């Protein structure tokens, strides 16, 4: 059950990451760092806020920030080296 | 690493020590396997509970009510503690 908690609470963030990828591929036309970080200083702030909100909710899942923190303590059911 | 095994003699030693260091017992050399807690050792209707809690603490166990009330002999406690694989 703890593993299920982890995987689903992280697929929440992966859903938001997928949304961010779609927005990036629409706005920038590419997912490569060299173009995105070359152009990023020109693009509308609203689109970048959408992108980074989605990617931050992904990071909010993985990094166990408060709204999506419930899996990190349950993951201690696994062995201590994990 | 954790090279330790329990035996009935070891359980008996630890339980008779536990009862010897209990002040509300009648006195020593009433404590044997055949001893009763109420009659022979002269224990009240809550010192048996204190003894069962002490056995829990000693052997690292959790004894529910339906298995706690039916401990009325020292040999019964020894049987019980030897019938639990996690008795430490």
């Amino acid at each position: 059950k703890s593993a299920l908690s982890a995987v689903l609470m992280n697929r929440f963030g992966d859903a938001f990451f997928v949304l961010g990828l779609c927005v990036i591929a629409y706005v920038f036309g590419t997912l490569n760092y060299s173009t995105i970080f070359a152009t990023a200083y020109l693009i509308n702030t609203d689109l970048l806020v959408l992108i980074m909100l989605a990617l931050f909710i992904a990071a909010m899942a993985k990094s166990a920030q408060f709204g999506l923190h419930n899996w990190l303590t349950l993951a201690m059911e696994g062995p201590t080296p994990v | 690493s954790s090279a330790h095994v329990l035996t009935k003699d070891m359980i008996q030693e630890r339980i008779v020590a536990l009862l010897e260091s209990f002040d509300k017992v009648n006195d020593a050399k009433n404590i044997t396997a055949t001893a009763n807690l109420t009659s022979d050792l002269g224990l009240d209707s809550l010192d048996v509970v204190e003894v069962v809690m002490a056995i829990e603490e000693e052997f690292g166990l959790e004894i529910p009510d339906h298995d706690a009330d039916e401990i009325k002999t020292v040999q019964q406690a020894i049987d019980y503690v030897s019938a639990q694989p996690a008795a430490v």
Binding site: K1 | E62, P64, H66
Partner: protein, 76 residues
Amino acid sequence: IRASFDKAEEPMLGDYPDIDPFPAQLKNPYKKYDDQQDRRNLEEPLSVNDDLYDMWSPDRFTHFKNQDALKYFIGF
């Protein structure tokens, strides 16, 4: 205790038994069951919403009733 979703299905049970659901998480772990992990004996009747009250269902928390828990959470 029957909840809203449980006693809403009363007109549909027909010949099925109307069973009082009690989650298995709160059942006594020290009794002996045929399925000790699921805490169920063999021929035990299942509520219509047993999916919600089995051991694979989400966890219950007994210490605080849920409305008080929401008060404390949103208060913090």
